[PDB]
Each structure stands twice: as C-alpha cells, then as structure tokens.
Amino acid sequence: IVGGYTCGANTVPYQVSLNSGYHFCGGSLINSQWVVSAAHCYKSGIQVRLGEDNINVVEGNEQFISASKSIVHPSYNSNTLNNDIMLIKLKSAASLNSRVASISLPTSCASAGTQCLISGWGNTKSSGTSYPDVLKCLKAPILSDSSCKSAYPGQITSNMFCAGYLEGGKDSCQGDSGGPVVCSGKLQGIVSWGSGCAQKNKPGVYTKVCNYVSWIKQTIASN
C-alpha cells in the first residue's frame, strides 16, 4: 500500500496473508473455512496466516492453517486478468473471535464515490520496493466507469472497477494482490492490478466481487 497508514493490530480481522515461506498475497476470510483471493496469486504449498499484524513476529493471535484446495475461477484469463478471483478452502476451520472474523459478501454492487478500505503488506514505494512488517491501510473511493475506461482503454471488463486517486501518491501495489476492498462492511473488491503503483491517472483495478456472489456460494456449497 503506497500513501496509506498503519492499520493498528487486528483492526482488519478478515485480512489474511498467503504464505509460502514469505508473504506473497493477501486474501479475505468469508467464513471459518474459506478465503477469497485473486486467481493470479494461485500456487501450491500455500499456508494461510490469520490474526496477523507484524508478519515477521509471532505476537499472538496468529492461526497458521494450510490450504486444503484452491479453486481458481474456470474462466480466469491470465492475459487480461478478467475473472481474477480464487477461493481457498482451509484444512481446518479457523477459531473466529474479535481478532479473526469473516467479512460479508455484498448483496448489491457499490456506486462510484463509495469510500472503501483497502489493506495489505504490499510495497509502500511507487519507485522501488519497501515491504512493511505490519498491515497498512488506505481509504479510497470507487471511481466512475468512464474515468476507469479512460485511464485503461480496452482493458476494463464488466468484472473490474477502479478505486484510488488520479493525482497519484495513494494506491495498492505488489504484495497487496488478493486482499480486500471493503465498503460499508461488505467485500466489494479484490486487489488485482494497476500500471505501476500510485502513478498519476493510473488508479488500481479491482475484481468486482458483487458479480461473483452466486458463483462463490455455489462453489462453496459443492466443496
């Protein structure tokens, strides 16, 4: 996250860290046995880390659980990143409490101007790499479809939306992929891609979760 702030320990209880010997992507806890992340974060040997704040120090509240299976959307296109969503089922359910909690899926999609909270342990530099130890936060508004397509002509599908600042300086970045975009207590997006990080007129692009609620429900119900 570039231009964000330190969230504060366990203030984002649905945020998870996908780990393979190091943090490589974020995710969101939607119930005690399933996590939603981005398809492009897929890999084998994933350990999901819940109740984290500093990812390099065991401070207490952490629950490390192996992924039993990862289900990448069947129509995921790695070239356009269309349908960039993945569900991970945990080997054992997580103990939920105030520090580890799930986030609600939306019933409707959000409108432009809605203010959301984006979080993650991704790079904090737009020009260079600086990874934080603790979770960073950023409040960002959803932009209009016209501004989004103007910024990324021919690359935005109906399953994506832009959130951020056209002036540059505040954005999600590498390491934040797969993590949550929460607006009014509902998971509306998944950090997906962008051109560099926090560059002017190049906002972040997120997977539009409201378009996938039935898929998620059906898939969880049959696995």
| Nearer residue to Cl ion within complex by CB, 134 or 166 | 166
Which residue, chain included where needed, has tokens 């994506």?
160
């520090």: which residue's tokens?
99
Catalytic residue among 70, 84, 102, 192: 84
Q: Is 61 in the site for Ca ion (CB under 5 A)?
A: no
| 39 touches ligand 847 (CB under 6 A) | no
CA 117 to CA 103: how far, in whole Å?
A: 12
159 annotated as a binding-site residue: no
Residues linked to residue 44 through DSSP beta bridges, in sequence order: none
Q: Is 176 a catalytic residue?
A: no
Inter-CA distances, 82 with 14, 208, 211, Å: 24, 10, 12
Catalytic site includes residue 73 = no
Q: Which does 70 bind (CB under 5 to 8 A by kind): Cl ion, Ca ion, ligand 847, none?
A: none
Known catalytic residue at 177: yes
174 binds, among Ca ion, ligand 847, Cl ion, none (CB under 5 to 8 A by kind): ligand 847
Q: Which range in 36-44, 55-63, 77-85, 151-159 contacts Ca ion by CB under 5 A?
A: 55-63
Q: Kindly tell me which of 134 and 213 has the beta carbon lying closer to Ca ion.
A: 134
| Cα dihedral 93/99/102/108 (nearest 10) | 180
Binding Cl ion (rule: CB under 5 A), the pick from 31, 141, 149, 150 is 149
CA 48 → CA 82, 93, 135, 196, 208, distances in Å? 24, 11, 15, 27, 23
Choosing from 26, 171, 182, 186, the residue that interacts with ligand 847 (CB under 6 A) is 171
**Does the annotation flag 172 for ligand binding?**
yes
- Beta strands per DSSP E along 73-126: 86-90, 115-120
Question: By C-beta, is 53 or 171 nearer to ligand 847?
Answer: 171
**If binding is defined by CB under 5 A, does position 114 make contact with Ca ion?**
no
How many residues comprise the chain? 223
Neighbouring-strand partners of residue 146: none
**Binding of ligand 847 at residue 197 (CB under 6 A)?**
yes
* Integer CA distances (angstroms), 33 to 28, 80, 88, 89, in order: 11, 29, 8, 6
Which residues of the chain form contacts with Cl ion (CB under 5 A)? 149, 153-154
Binding-site residues from annotation: 52, 54, 57, 62, 171-172, 174-175, 177
Output the known binding site for substrate: 171-172, 174-175, 177
Active-site residues, by number, are 40, 84, 177
